[PDB]
CSV table of C-alpha atoms in Angstrom, one decimal:
chain,number,residue,atom,x,y,z
A,18,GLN,CA,-51.9,203.9,78.6
A,19,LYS,CA,-52.1,201.1,81.2
A,20,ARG,CA,-50.6,198.4,78.9
A,21,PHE,CA,-47.3,197.2,80.5
A,22,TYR,CA,-46.7,197.4,84.2
A,23,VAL,CA,-43.6,196.1,85.9
A,24,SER,CA,-42.9,195.9,89.6
A,25,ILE,CA,-39.8,197.7,90.8
A,26,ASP,CA,-37.9,194.5,91.5
A,27,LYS,CA,-37.9,193.8,87.8
A,28,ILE,CA,-36.5,197.2,87.0
A,29,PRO,CA,-32.7,197.5,86.4
A,30,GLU,CA,-30.8,199.7,89.0
A,31,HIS,CA,-29.2,201.6,86.1
A,32,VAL,CA,-32.7,202.7,85.1
A,33,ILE,CA,-33.8,203.7,88.5
A,34,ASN,CA,-30.5,205.5,89.1
A,35,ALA,CA,-30.7,207.2,85.7
A,36,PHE,CA,-34.0,208.7,86.5
A,37,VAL,CA,-33.0,209.7,90.0
A,38,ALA,CA,-29.7,211.4,89.1
A,39,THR,CA,-31.5,213.2,86.2
A,40,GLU,CA,-34.8,214.3,87.8
A,41,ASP,CA,-34.6,214.1,91.6
A,42,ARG,CA,-31.0,213.4,92.8
A,43,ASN,CA,-32.3,213.5,96.4
A,44,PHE,CA,-35.5,211.5,95.9
A,45,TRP,CA,-34.5,208.9,98.6
A,46,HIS,CA,-34.1,211.5,101.3
A,47,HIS,CA,-36.7,214.2,101.0
A,48,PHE,CA,-40.4,214.2,102.0
A,49,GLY,CA,-42.0,215.0,98.7
A,50,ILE,CA,-40.7,218.5,98.4
A,51,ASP,CA,-37.0,219.3,98.1
A,52,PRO,CA,-36.1,222.7,99.6
A,53,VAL,CA,-32.4,222.7,98.7
A,54,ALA,CA,-33.4,221.6,95.1
A,55,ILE,CA,-35.6,224.7,94.8
A,56,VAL,CA,-32.9,226.9,96.2
A,57,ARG,CA,-30.2,225.3,94.0
A,58,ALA,CA,-32.7,225.7,91.2
A,59,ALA,CA,-32.9,229.3,92.2
A,60,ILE,CA,-29.1,230.0,92.5
A,61,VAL,CA,-28.5,228.3,89.1
A,62,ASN,CA,-31.5,230.5,88.1
A,63,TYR,CA,-30.2,234.1,87.8
A,64,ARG,CA,-26.6,232.8,87.5
A,65,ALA,CA,-27.5,230.9,84.3
A,66,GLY,CA,-30.0,233.2,82.6
A,67,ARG,CA,-32.6,233.8,85.3
A,68,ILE,CA,-33.7,230.1,84.7
A,69,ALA,CA,-32.3,226.6,84.6
A,70,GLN,CA,-32.9,223.8,87.2
A,71,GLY,CA,-36.4,222.2,87.8
A,72,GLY,CA,-36.9,222.0,91.6
A,73,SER,CA,-39.6,219.4,91.1
A,74,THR,CA,-39.2,216.1,92.8
A,75,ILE,CA,-40.3,212.8,91.3
A,76,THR,CA,-43.2,212.7,93.7
A,77,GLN,CA,-44.4,216.1,92.6
A,78,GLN,CA,-44.2,214.7,89.0
A,79,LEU,CA,-46.2,211.7,90.0
A,80,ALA,CA,-48.8,214.0,91.6
A,81,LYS,CA,-48.8,216.4,88.6
A,82,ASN,CA,-49.8,213.4,86.5
A,83,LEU,CA,-52.6,212.4,88.8
A,84,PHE,CA,-54.8,215.3,87.8
A,85,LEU,CA,-57.4,214.7,85.1
A,86,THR,CA,-57.1,218.2,83.6
A,87,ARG,CA,-53.7,219.7,82.9
A,88,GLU,CA,-53.7,223.2,84.2
A,89,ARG,CA,-50.3,224.6,85.2
A,90,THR,CA,-51.3,227.5,87.5
A,91,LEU,CA,-49.7,228.3,90.8
A,92,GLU,CA,-52.2,226.7,93.1
A,93,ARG,CA,-51.9,223.7,90.9
A,94,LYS,CA,-48.3,223.3,91.7
A,95,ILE,CA,-49.3,223.7,95.3
A,96,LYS,CA,-52.1,221.1,95.2
A,97,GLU,CA,-49.4,218.8,93.7
A,98,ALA,CA,-47.0,219.7,96.5
A,99,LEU,CA,-49.6,218.8,99.1
A,100,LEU,CA,-50.5,215.7,97.3
A,101,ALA,CA,-46.9,214.6,97.0
A,102,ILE,CA,-46.4,215.2,100.7
A,103,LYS,CA,-49.4,213.0,101.6
A,104,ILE,CA,-48.3,210.4,99.1
A,105,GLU,CA,-44.9,210.4,100.9
A,106,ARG,CA,-46.6,209.8,104.2
A,107,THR,CA,-48.7,207.0,102.8
A,108,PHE,CA,-46.3,204.9,100.6
A,109,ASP,CA,-42.6,204.3,100.8
A,110,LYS,CA,-40.0,205.5,98.3
A,111,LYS,CA,-39.6,202.2,96.4
A,112,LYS,CA,-43.4,202.2,95.9
A,113,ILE,CA,-43.6,205.8,94.7
A,114,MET,CA,-40.6,205.1,92.4
A,115,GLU,CA,-42.5,202.1,91.1
A,116,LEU,CA,-45.7,204.0,90.4
A,117,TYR,CA,-43.9,207.0,88.9
A,118,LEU,CA,-41.7,204.8,86.6
A,119,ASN,CA,-44.8,203.0,85.2
A,120,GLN,CA,-46.9,206.1,84.6
A,121,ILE,CA,-44.3,208.5,83.2
A,122,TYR,CA,-44.9,209.5,79.6
A,123,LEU,CA,-41.7,208.8,77.6
A,124,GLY,CA,-42.9,209.8,74.1
A,125,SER,CA,-44.0,208.0,71.0
A,126,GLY,CA,-47.2,206.9,72.8
A,127,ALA,CA,-45.1,205.0,75.4
A,128,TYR,CA,-46.1,205.1,79.1
A,129,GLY,CA,-43.8,203.7,81.7
A,130,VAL,CA,-40.3,202.2,81.3
A,131,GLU,CA,-41.6,198.8,80.1
A,132,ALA,CA,-43.6,200.4,77.3
A,133,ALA,CA,-40.6,202.5,76.3
A,134,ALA,CA,-38.0,199.6,76.5
A,135,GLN,CA,-40.2,198.1,73.7
A,136,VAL,CA,-41.0,201.1,71.6
A,137,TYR,CA,-37.4,202.3,71.6
A,138,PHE,CA,-35.3,199.1,71.9
A,139,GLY,CA,-37.5,196.1,71.2
A,140,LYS,CA,-36.5,194.8,74.7
A,141,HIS,CA,-38.0,194.5,78.2
A,142,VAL,CA,-37.1,197.1,80.7
A,143,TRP,CA,-35.0,194.5,82.5
A,144,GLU,CA,-32.9,193.8,79.4
A,145,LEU,CA,-31.7,197.4,79.1
A,146,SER,CA,-28.1,198.5,79.1
A,147,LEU,CA,-26.7,201.5,80.9
A,148,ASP,CA,-26.8,203.7,77.8
A,149,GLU,CA,-30.3,202.5,77.1
A,150,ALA,CA,-31.4,203.3,80.6
A,151,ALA,CA,-29.8,206.7,80.3
A,152,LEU,CA,-31.7,207.5,77.1
A,153,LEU,CA,-35.1,206.9,78.8
A,154,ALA,CA,-34.2,209.1,81.7
A,155,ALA,CA,-33.4,211.9,79.2
A,156,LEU,CA,-37.0,211.8,77.9
A,157,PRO,CA,-39.2,212.9,80.8
A,158,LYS,CA,-38.4,216.6,80.6
A,159,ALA,CA,-39.6,216.7,77.0
A,160,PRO,CA,-40.4,213.6,75.0
A,161,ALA,CA,-41.0,215.4,71.7
A,162,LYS,CA,-37.9,217.6,71.9
A,163,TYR,CA,-35.6,214.7,72.7
A,164,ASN,CA,-37.4,211.9,70.8
A,165,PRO,CA,-34.6,209.6,69.4
A,166,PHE,CA,-36.9,208.9,66.4
A,167,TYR,CA,-36.7,212.4,64.9
A,168,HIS,CA,-34.3,214.4,67.1
A,169,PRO,CA,-31.6,211.8,67.5
A,170,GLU,CA,-29.2,214.8,67.7
A,171,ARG,CA,-30.6,216.3,70.8
A,172,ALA,CA,-31.5,212.8,72.1
A,173,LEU,CA,-28.0,211.4,72.1
A,174,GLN,CA,-26.8,214.6,73.6
A,175,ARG,CA,-29.2,214.6,76.6
A,176,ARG,CA,-28.5,210.9,77.0
A,177,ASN,CA,-24.8,211.5,77.5
A,178,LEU,CA,-25.8,214.3,79.9
A,179,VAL,CA,-27.9,211.8,82.0
A,180,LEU,CA,-24.8,209.5,82.0
A,181,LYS,CA,-22.7,212.3,83.4
A,182,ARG,CA,-25.2,213.0,86.2
A,183,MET,CA,-25.1,209.3,87.0
A,184,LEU,CA,-21.3,209.4,87.1
A,185,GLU,CA,-21.3,212.4,89.3
A,186,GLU,CA,-23.8,210.8,91.6
A,187,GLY,CA,-21.5,207.8,91.8
A,188,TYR,CA,-24.1,205.5,90.2
A,189,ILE,CA,-21.6,204.4,87.5
A,190,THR,CA,-17.8,204.2,87.2
A,191,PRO,CA,-15.6,206.3,85.0
A,192,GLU,CA,-15.0,203.1,83.0
A,193,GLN,CA,-18.7,202.5,82.4
A,194,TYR,CA,-19.3,206.1,81.6
A,195,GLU,CA,-16.7,206.3,78.8
A,196,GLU,CA,-18.2,203.0,77.6
A,197,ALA,CA,-21.8,204.3,77.5
A,198,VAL,CA,-21.2,207.7,76.1
A,199,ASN,CA,-19.7,206.1,73.0
A,200,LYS,CA,-22.7,203.7,72.3
B,18,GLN,CA,-48.4,204.6,108.8
B,19,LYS,CA,-46.1,203.1,106.1
B,20,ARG,CA,-45.0,200.1,108.1
B,21,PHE,CA,-46.2,196.9,106.5
B,22,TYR,CA,-46.8,196.7,102.7
B,23,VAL,CA,-47.9,193.6,100.9
B,24,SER,CA,-48.2,193.1,97.1
B,25,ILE,CA,-51.6,192.0,96.0
B,26,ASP,CA,-50.4,188.6,95.1
B,27,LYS,CA,-49.7,187.8,98.8
B,28,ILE,CA,-53.3,188.9,99.7
B,29,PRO,CA,-55.9,186.2,100.2
B,30,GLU,CA,-58.8,186.3,97.7
B,31,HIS,CA,-61.2,186.1,100.6
B,32,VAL,CA,-59.8,189.4,101.8
B,33,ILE,CA,-60.0,191.1,98.5
B,34,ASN,CA,-63.5,189.8,97.9
B,35,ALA,CA,-64.6,190.7,101.4
B,36,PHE,CA,-63.7,194.3,100.7
B,37,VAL,CA,-65.2,194.4,97.2
B,38,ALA,CA,-68.5,192.9,98.2
B,39,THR,CA,-68.8,195.3,101.2
B,40,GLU,CA,-67.5,198.6,99.8
B,41,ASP,CA,-67.6,198.5,96.0
B,42,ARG,CA,-69.3,195.3,94.6
B,43,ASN,CA,-68.7,196.6,91.0
B,44,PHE,CA,-65.1,197.7,91.5
B,45,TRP,CA,-63.8,195.5,88.7
B,46,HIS,CA,-66.1,196.9,86.1
B,47,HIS,CA,-66.5,200.7,86.7
B,48,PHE,CA,-64.2,203.5,85.7
B,49,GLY,CA,-63.7,205.1,89.1
B,50,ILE,CA,-67.2,206.3,89.5
B,51,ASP,CA,-70.2,204.0,89.8
B,52,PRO,CA,-73.4,205.5,88.4
B,53,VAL,CA,-75.7,202.6,89.3
B,54,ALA,CA,-74.2,202.5,92.8
B,55,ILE,CA,-75.1,206.2,93.3
B,56,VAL,CA,-78.7,205.6,92.0
B,57,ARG,CA,-79.0,202.3,94.0
B,58,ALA,CA,-77.7,204.3,97.0
B,59,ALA,CA,-80.4,206.9,96.1
B,60,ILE,CA,-83.3,204.4,95.8
B,61,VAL,CA,-82.3,202.7,99.0
B,62,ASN,CA,-82.1,206.3,100.2
B,63,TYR,CA,-85.6,207.7,100.7
B,64,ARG,CA,-86.9,204.1,100.8
B,65,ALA,CA,-84.8,203.3,103.9
B,66,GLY,CA,-85.0,206.6,105.8
B,67,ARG,CA,-83.8,209.1,103.2
B,68,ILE,CA,-80.3,207.7,103.7
B,69,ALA,CA,-78.4,204.3,103.5
B,70,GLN,CA,-75.9,203.2,100.8
B,71,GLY,CA,-72.6,204.8,100.2
B,72,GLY,CA,-72.2,205.2,96.4
B,73,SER,CA,-68.4,205.7,96.9
B,74,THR,CA,-66.2,203.3,94.9
B,75,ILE,CA,-62.9,202.0,96.3
B,76,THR,CA,-61.0,204.3,94.0
B,77,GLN,CA,-62.9,207.4,95.3
B,78,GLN,CA,-61.8,206.1,98.8
B,79,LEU,CA,-58.2,205.8,97.7
B,80,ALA,CA,-58.4,209.3,96.3
B,81,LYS,CA,-60.2,210.7,99.4
B,82,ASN,CA,-57.2,209.5,101.4
B,83,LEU,CA,-54.6,211.1,99.1
B,84,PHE,CA,-55.4,214.6,100.3
B,85,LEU,CA,-53.3,216.0,103.1
B,86,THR,CA,-56.1,218.0,104.7
B,87,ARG,CA,-59.4,216.3,105.4
B,88,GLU,CA,-62.2,218.6,104.3
B,89,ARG,CA,-65.5,216.9,103.3
B,90,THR,CA,-67.1,219.6,101.2
B,91,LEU,CA,-68.9,219.1,97.9
B,92,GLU,CA,-66.1,220.2,95.5
B,93,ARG,CA,-63.8,217.9,97.6
B,94,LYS,CA,-65.9,214.9,96.7
B,95,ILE,CA,-65.6,216.1,93.1
B,96,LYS,CA,-61.8,216.6,93.2
B,97,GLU,CA,-61.8,213.0,94.5
B,98,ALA,CA,-64.1,211.8,91.7
B,99,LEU,CA,-61.8,213.4,89.0
B,100,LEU,CA,-58.7,212.0,90.7
B,101,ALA,CA,-60.3,208.6,90.9
B,102,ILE,CA,-61.0,208.7,87.2
B,103,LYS,CA,-57.5,209.7,86.2
B,104,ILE,CA,-56.2,207.1,88.6
B,105,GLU,CA,-58.4,204.6,86.8
B,106,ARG,CA,-56.9,205.7,83.4
B,107,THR,CA,-53.4,205.4,84.8
B,108,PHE,CA,-53.2,202.1,86.8
B,109,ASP,CA,-55.1,198.8,86.5
B,110,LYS,CA,-57.7,197.5,89.0
B,111,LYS,CA,-55.3,195.0,90.6
B,112,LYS,CA,-52.9,197.9,91.3
B,113,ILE,CA,-55.5,200.2,92.6
B,114,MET,CA,-56.9,197.4,94.8
B,115,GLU,CA,-53.3,196.9,96.0
B,116,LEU,CA,-52.7,200.5,96.9
B,117,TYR,CA,-56.1,201.0,98.5
B,118,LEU,CA,-55.8,197.8,100.6
B,119,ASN,CA,-52.4,198.9,102.0
B,120,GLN,CA,-53.4,202.5,102.9
B,121,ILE,CA,-56.9,202.0,104.2
B,122,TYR,CA,-57.2,202.8,108.0
B,123,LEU,CA,-58.6,199.8,109.8
B,124,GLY,CA,-58.5,201.2,113.4
B,125,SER,CA,-56.3,200.7,116.4
B,126,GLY,CA,-53.6,202.6,114.6
B,127,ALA,CA,-53.5,200.0,111.9
B,128,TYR,CA,-53.0,201.0,108.2
B,129,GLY,CA,-53.4,198.4,105.5
B,130,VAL,CA,-54.5,194.7,105.7
B,131,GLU,CA,-51.0,193.5,106.8
B,132,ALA,CA,-50.9,195.9,109.8
B,133,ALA,CA,-54.5,194.9,110.7
B,134,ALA,CA,-53.9,191.1,110.4
B,135,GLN,CA,-51.2,191.7,113.1
B,136,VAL,CA,-53.0,194.1,115.4
B,137,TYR,CA,-56.2,192.1,115.3
B,138,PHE,CA,-55.2,188.4,114.9
B,139,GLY,CA,-51.4,188.2,115.4
B,140,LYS,CA,-51.1,186.8,111.9
B,141,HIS,CA,-50.0,187.9,108.4
B,142,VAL,CA,-52.7,189.0,106.0
B,143,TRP,CA,-52.0,185.8,104.0
B,144,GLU,CA,-52.7,183.6,107.0
B,145,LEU,CA,-56.3,185.0,107.5
B,146,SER,CA,-59.4,182.9,107.5
B,147,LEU,CA,-62.7,183.8,105.7
B,148,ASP,CA,-64.2,185.1,109.0
B,149,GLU,CA,-61.0,187.0,109.7
B,150,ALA,CA,-61.0,188.6,106.3
B,151,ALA,CA,-64.7,189.5,106.7
B,152,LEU,CA,-63.9,191.3,110.0
B,153,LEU,CA,-61.4,193.6,108.4
B,154,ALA,CA,-63.8,194.5,105.5
B,155,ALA,CA,-66.3,195.5,108.2
B,156,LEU,CA,-63.9,198.1,109.5
B,157,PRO,CA,-63.4,200.7,106.7
B,158,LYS,CA,-66.8,202.4,107.1
B,159,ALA,CA,-66.0,203.2,110.8
B,160,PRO,CA,-63.0,201.7,112.6
B,161,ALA,CA,-63.9,203.2,116.1
B,162,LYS,CA,-67.6,202.2,115.9
B,163,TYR,CA,-66.9,198.6,114.9
B,164,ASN,CA,-63.5,198.1,116.6
B,165,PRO,CA,-63.6,194.5,117.9
B,166,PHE,CA,-61.5,195.6,120.9
B,167,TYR,CA,-64.3,197.6,122.5
B,168,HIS,CA,-67.4,197.2,120.4
B,169,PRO,CA,-67.1,193.4,119.8
B,170,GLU,CA,-71.0,193.5,119.7
B,171,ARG,CA,-71.3,195.8,116.7
B,172,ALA,CA,-68.1,194.3,115.3
B,173,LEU,CA,-69.2,190.7,115.1
B,174,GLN,CA,-72.5,191.8,113.7
B,175,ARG,CA,-71.1,193.9,110.8
B,176,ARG,CA,-68.6,191.0,110.2
B,177,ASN,CA,-71.5,188.5,109.6
B,178,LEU,CA,-73.0,191.2,107.4
B,179,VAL,CA,-69.8,191.3,105.3
B,180,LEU,CA,-70.1,187.5,105.0
B,181,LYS,CA,-73.6,187.7,103.8
B,182,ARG,CA,-72.6,190.3,101.1
B,183,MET,CA,-69.8,187.9,100.0
B,184,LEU,CA,-72.3,185.0,99.9
B,185,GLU,CA,-74.7,187.1,97.8
B,186,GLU,CA,-71.9,188.1,95.5
B,187,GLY,CA,-71.1,184.4,95.1
B,188,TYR,CA,-67.6,184.8,96.6
B,189,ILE,CA,-68.3,182.1,99.2
B,190,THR,CA,-70.5,179.0,99.4
B,191,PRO,CA,-73.5,178.6,101.7
B,192,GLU,CA,-71.5,175.9,103.5
B,193,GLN,CA,-68.6,178.4,104.1
B,194,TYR,CA,-71.0,181.1,105.1
B,195,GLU,CA,-72.7,179.0,107.8
B,196,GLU,CA,-69.2,178.1,109.0
B,197,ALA,CA,-67.8,181.6,109.2
B,198,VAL,CA,-70.8,183.3,110.8
B,199,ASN,CA,-70.4,180.9,113.7
B,200,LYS,CA,-66.7,181.7,114.3
């Protein structure tokens, strides 16, 4: 799971933005933990079926994956929160983004955006289109549930959802959006 | 402490080698933990005053520095060992080396080789000489004890010690060694 690595400079901005708008819209501004995100995850909590948003920042996700074992207790989330905060104090956002983007499991035995660009589109991460970038960003939350190889229904759906988030965040134009959702 | 970052490709091989020969001679071959190193640290333990070598790999050092708090308990060393092993499974050696080399505290408020190349020699890490590289590698174990700014005695000494390790590891030639130790 250390096959393809790619520096952040060789990663399309559509890809980075796709992941940010989908998983941590604030990423560039917080310190490893996102307060508002936890509260916004809490207000869209009981107001959407006592559960919805994630609250977890990209950094917490990176941390989460730095543990050998895979417990999911409370203190675990905390050890990840502390780790994420130290990580934030040690490396800059572009570096954290880079690491996260290269370690993130994206299903079908693919780790990192490069590996995924290959397994899913036979291309290099830097050859990806907006709609291709959007598809990858839709995987992190659940690679097996949204795997385009056997749940293309849910996959395509969550992909167009990523695209809407990007549009709302201003990462893409209405023109580009209409274009992508139809691919 | 996130000021100057420098990709590993812009880092002199004398620098990398200086750190490897001094802190983790096996770095490129182990899996995050170095068994032999712990045993060799143990045999040169009672045979040198019941204590000497370090046993800690570069990866354990990186891990050690990824904790917000700075405890030094037993389980702490273990959490670092597990972390180091997962890190090893996630990123390749050149990447780990890169991260470690950019986070490592080298005294005088300098973090990373770039920051140090400036604070200590007014140069960029890539402009360093063998004897300059050697000096930095001599800092990690104790920046205040070996700080060239006020312990130039101990500093110069441990610097020539790094140079000997490099020579023994074959990273430099006898010619280069004699040259450097006299700078």
